[PDB]
Amino acid sequence: AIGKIQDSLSSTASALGKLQDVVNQNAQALNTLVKQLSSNFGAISSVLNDILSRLDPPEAEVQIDRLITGRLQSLQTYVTQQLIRAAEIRASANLA
Amino acid sequence: FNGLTGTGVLTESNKKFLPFQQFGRDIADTTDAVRDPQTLEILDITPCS
């Protein structure tokens, strides 16, 4: 039976999907947090230094405020996703 | 660099830019490498430690 377990583990990696899915979900979580920086969120440009280099403060405040609002809301979304997945992994740790 | 402002470490890179390519872009829509506007040379932008 030990030899059969070794043979199965050497043959297929699909058994470890219960860890692969968690690792992958963390991967798309950080990838989402990365790619949400590229969004304008109603601003004229998504690059903060580009906004700073173009505009005077009386409109730069509004444009940067829009960018901050979009980025923070996307981050809060990531925070709640991480918290609920932490609750899942907590229950999993309790069971283990 | 041609109006593109930022803070980082300018190092010599080994990236193979095509002759019509003037800068490189990372995944997060941030500048990764640039071509010098005065010298036909390739430099990578690494953020400071």
Binding site: - | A28, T30, T46
Partner: peptide, 27 residues
């Protein structure tokens, strides 16, 4: 990567995890 996101290392790495499992198996 360079956008302020970091990965903190775990307190117990793989070596002491393996030592804990070895102690449990031996016991």
């Amino acid at each position: 990567k360079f956008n302020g996101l970091t990965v903190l290392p775990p307190l117990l790495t793989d070596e002491m995890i393996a030592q804990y499992t070895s102690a449990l198996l031996a016991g």
